[PDB]
């Protein structure tokens, strides 16, 4: 199974930015509150406006992440010296496009700008995670980290910002995004654990957790309100996710049968391989219409599980003569969560660079 073809991964589009005319409001504030020449900080203002145009049209590569993190950190450093939040003195309109409707949504709130950047940091991480072939140890590790970082950005957004600046960043949609991203992170780790040939029981538990994360996403996708908001995106996500629930349930029970093999529980081995085959047959049904990438992974896995089942049953029928337990007596596999949303510290100097606005007060 370490050589199974990789399943495709879902990634999220980045949001499109509108205007954020911060320069006039910063100049008035410096004049009326610091008493200094309003244009003594034009080079700091020039650095920020350049950084914004770079961020709102960011390159879709790993370097793009540092650009977004730079701009996000510098917005924090600006907010801590110039009050531009909701209701505050120097607040100006911030406009971005809500991604599911295409409608412009404006708020006079610098935290809306921060939120949309953080959203795009999560989305870019999801795209970089989904781009790798995931065939090397380092590519599997890096993809896993990108999906955890994506989860981290959407989780931070959900926890630290006035909920619902727009409906693409509502708490329930962000939670769907987190659970999908963690499910994809855990899938990357499952692939890595099979390459590393970890203990069969641990691999089963890792796979069971992939199922658990994808069940959380699937339940959220079945919410009619979310289906309505996402439109055909909900159909495309749900088809892949529901298929993967049965696929990784098959992979889990395959590895429970390998544990039984190792323990010389040869009737239990047959039962788990039979259950794995039943779960895989449902996944193949649910995969109708999916791309060849999905079919190639399922075809490969059917060869593995079908061959293991036929030989386990032959061995048991002609050698071991052990009783085969009913499938509904098998101990369920408890997922092993080995991923988490990974930090967004917006003001870590190692990532923000020098504070553009250090020479303010």
Residue numbers in the entry: 1 to 361
Manuscript excerpt for this entry:
His domain protein tyrosine phosphatase (HD-PTP/PTPN23) is a tumor suppressor that regulates mitogenic receptor downregulation, endocytic recycling, and cell migration (Chen et al., 2012, Doyotte et al., 2008, Kharitidi et al., 2015, Lee et al., 2007, Ma et al., 2015, Manteghi et al., 2016). A central feature of HD-PTP function is the ability of its Bro1 domain to recruit CHMP4, the major subunit of the ESCRT-III membrane remodeling protein complex (Doyotte et al., 2008, Ichioka et al., 2007, Parkinson et al., 2015). Crystallographic structures of the HD-PTPBro1 domain in complex with the relevant binding regions of SARA, endofin, and all three human CHMP4 isoforms reveal that SARA and endofin binding is similar to that of CHMP4 at the conserved site, but critically extends into a neighboring specific pocket unique to HD-PTP. Altogether, this study identifies the Bro1 domain of HD-PTP as a highly selective interaction hub that coordinates recruitment of endosomal signaling adaptors versus MVB sorting and receptor degradation.
However, the two hydrophobic pockets, critical for binding of the CHMP4 peptides, are occluded in the apo-HD-PTPBro1 structure, requiring several side-chain conformational changes to accommodate the peptides. This may contribute to maintaining HD-PTP in an inactive status by minimizing interactions between cytosolic pools of CHMP4 and HD-PTP. In contrast, these pockets are fully open in the apo structures of Alix and Brox (McCullough et al., 2008, Mu et al., 2012). In the apo-HD-PTPBro1 structure these are blocked by the side chains of K141, K192, and R198. Thus, binding of CHMP4A/B/C to HD-PTPBro1 requires rearrangement of these side chains to accommodate the critical CHMP4 Leu and Trp residues. A major finding from the structural analysis is that the endofin and SARA binding site expands from the common site to a neighboring specific pocket (S site), not occupied by the CHMP4 peptides and fully accessible in the apo-HD-PTPBro1 structure. Significantly, the S site appears fully open and accessible in the structure of the apo-HD-PTPBro1, and no major conformational changes are observed upon binding of SARA/endofin peptides.
